[PDB]
């Protein structure tokens, strides 16, 4: 699906709030509050507009300590089944499969050091797969943002 | 500012649909369409709920190319200066200050390998502080969500 | 367990000297020698102060080979029973469950690398748990003292 | 300064407890209340003996985050000079000289990883002999003692 | 087999082009068209011509990633049977047998990194020899060339 | 530039001999002797047919020391002047800038260690931009081969 | 074993000419035929003199590619039986036990790259508790020397 | 100088006894006196034979510390003028110009780590082409011999 000025208008608009009515984007690019309306709606059957939520700060819900963590696993083959295993883990908000070093890499994020320590011994380092995590502690995260279509 | 259960509820509602009513929340719980409007303003002030905002897909935008680069200085004090060059450009959506062997930590998201080409050398490397990058490519991203408060 | 201005000054004092007599400290402070006394108590069972004891210098005994030892398992599942081998051995005198490369990071004292080298290979790496060891010999140790609470 | 098995007798006694009665380690090794005393100054005034202090935890006074740093330095002769400026600081416990890859290696002890943060930004890697620093962050520190005589 | 300065003048003009005329070198180097055709039929048994062919080029036919990849294996031993797994696979043009860290060090051209991460884990990574793969995916190609005998 | 399957029936057949025969092809495919000629000259201009050149196996002109050497600069701004200092050597056959650890992977062909050790001291490593180097040298070189298009 | 300048004056003489005659150091040192006789005598009965032998040049013997390996175990606990193995190669000239990465660091001498390549793959990887080898090739070796006792 | 059977014999038995008999030899291969006495004598012109010498034992001497030590610099160029520098110190024994991470890696024998301590530091850090230094220690030489040609 390609993408107008007209889409990326809307996606910077509604991006920075979902509630900016489309009534009043209408006015701004000097179109109906009707092909907003479908634009959008285009948009989200493409996949490009996954849907509108509250972002949340984990900070200021005591989320101290978070981290990347590189998995190396014991043989390269066993990928798919670390990944499933890692998935129910809910302090795992992120995987990758990347260049490297590593088999995977991942973010989890955790209130403590105490916490963190919990999850990594007996929640991740017990998985069979794995023969070594190496985890890089976030001490500073100055900037965090988006994508800007 | 620490948060019950009726807090949490709010939340886990709101991260899936900003849009959902508080109207049903307070028949969900069995509270007042009011204490809802109140708990959000709460947790908005203390900085908690930071926006309302559609969620975009990168892949569906385009961005093929994922990475994470590792950046390495020529001396370690420089990481503030090196920080205010990094954080001007725009395809680079995350920045951390982690532990292990590099200075900063950073994701940029770029549509193509000659355009990543082109940022690393003319944009990322031109920056004057910065000895070394190492960027790991992401081939999949399989795990992608959020803090689940 | 919290701790007063009065709990930091004790400290300090006990920390130099174990013998520095309760009724030095009152007059030192403005209190009774009987707060003195009970102060103290109550750091012990908080677990703050975990004993009186001489200190020795392992060097002027002839340990003149101290190492830290990176441990690297076959797997990271593997560190509970790694340790618990470890811990009955009395070269080892610390040991660390550490970010970044290895599994468990260990400090042994040795009084020459000719011990050292027999500690190394017929008590610590037998442990069948382990893959590779990477040892750091210490050279010189010019700053070894104590939080300043 | 050669010791023998008296001394180690009294080294083992009072390194569990300073305050132990000379007169009961003389009903102990079969010896005189004044042999006891004797022995005792001359491991001091050999150095072997370097004190008598009461022992504190760091944890029960709220460092959650000890750490080691490995600190490498723009060239190798500059470790008289960035010694000088790290043993200025008092959240460095511990400093030495080894083998392997890094120049410094040294312990410090934080509260949390926010003032850890602070540390090492403001107070390690404004040193500017200081290339590169990495820190290995301690999750678990299940041994902890001495060298047993 | 030695070789000429008639030698070398022949597979300079050949290896520039494979179509210029025997006739047209014989004038140039004062010989007949008859000793160039044996010359370069001696450098064919030789083995140092090894054919005439067109040269290509991958990136104008859509091989947009190419990469070097390292790979480890479980054990040394395990080379043989590991390159007979890769040399079956298409996108492996190359395979070295190198110092330094890597068992077998390969080239593979993909099209994408969608295709590369297909190739990676679902034809690499699945031989069973291989603990693990360290891609360096090629960001420009700014020389390739011959040897100029 | 898109290619169907006469294209590629093409470039199969004239990058295993250059000299094949038009008028073979078109019997071959059932075309004319004309489109042959017209496919393969719109490839040229298209730049996906680069040449015809015979091949030389630098093994049997004397060549056993082949080697890959990562190149590591004093600062990564440096890449567009090392890389021209690079390219002047003619033992320099190919180099890319790449992920991963170097700023500039290249190839030597060199006919002996003492050659390329003369190349690295004197014309690789006198090149001012250039921290250190690694090679890898090639001690087997099994698989050597193309894009299968 | 003890030694006096007298004992270090012989081995400087002998250790530069075995055959320097014992009655011209008798007149050198201003002591007997007699004494030098049995100093040397006692050296060799130390086991500080171990023989006199010629010393030859491996690299006049065509031995033009030295090097070092670093050799790395499955499990540590395999050194002695590795070790075992590589003795019996006549090509292993040297080995360690040395601190840092490596399980064990071994000296081999070979004429050719292409000798070093089947040692390598069917003499020493083929040792069944080897996991890898890393080889560094011996370009140069400017200073070869004796301890100067 | 290529050498036969009786160039290799003669070589054989004095690397193990400078001393034996030319009488021996001769009567042994069955030649003459004389051949013997000649073939050692190209041997030497050819540089081959570079000398007689009685072999030490460092060990026995008190060297308790061998260690390598890979020196990195500040610039490659920079390796003629660390050489010069680091053959002056007498307890560099030997230096090698290889292949892997390291520009220059050197052996040092000393008599204790306070030694080796004091070298370091003193005599070869502060050798100011050289960046870092990493030293690996022999805790064990179980393996040292000679081509056996
Ligand atoms: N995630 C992976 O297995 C990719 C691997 N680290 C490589 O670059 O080859
Ligand atoms: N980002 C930093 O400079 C921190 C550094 N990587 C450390 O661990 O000490
Ligand atoms: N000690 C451990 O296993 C922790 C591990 N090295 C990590 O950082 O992930
Ligand atoms: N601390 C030092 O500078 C010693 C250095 N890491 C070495 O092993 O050579
Ligand atoms: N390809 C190999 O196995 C060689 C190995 N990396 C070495 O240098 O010892
Ligand atoms: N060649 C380069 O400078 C790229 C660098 N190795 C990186 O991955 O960031
Ligand atoms: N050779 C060995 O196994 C010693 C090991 N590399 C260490 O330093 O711990
Ligand atoms: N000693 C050197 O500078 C050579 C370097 N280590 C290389 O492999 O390129
Ligand atoms: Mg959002
Ligand atoms: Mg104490
Ligand atoms: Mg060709
Ligand atoms: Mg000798």
Same mark, same amino acid.
């Given at each position: 699906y390609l993408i107008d000025n007209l889409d990326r208008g809307i996606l910077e608009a509604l991006m920075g709030?979902?509630?900016?009515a489309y009534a009043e984007l209408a006015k701004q690019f000097g179109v109906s509050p009707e092909t907003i309306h479908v634009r959008v709606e285009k948009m989200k059957q493409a996949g490009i507009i996954t849907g509108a939520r509250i972002d949340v700060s984990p900070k200021q819900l005591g989320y101290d300590v978070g981290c990347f963590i590189g998995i190396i696993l014991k043989s390269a083959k066993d990928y798919p089944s670390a990944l499933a295993k890692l998935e &129910?883990?809910? /302090?795992?908000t992120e995987a990758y499969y990347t260049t490297?070093?590593? &088999?995977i890499f991942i973010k989890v994020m955790c209130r403590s050091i105490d916490a963190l320590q919990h999850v990594l011994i007996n929640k991740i380092q017990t998985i069979? /797969?794995?023969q070594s995590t190496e985890t890089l502690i976030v001490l500073q995260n100055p900037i965090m943002r988006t994508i800007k279509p």
């Open positions: 709030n979902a509630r900016t &129910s883990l809910d /302090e795992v490297g070093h590593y &088999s069979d /797969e794995i």
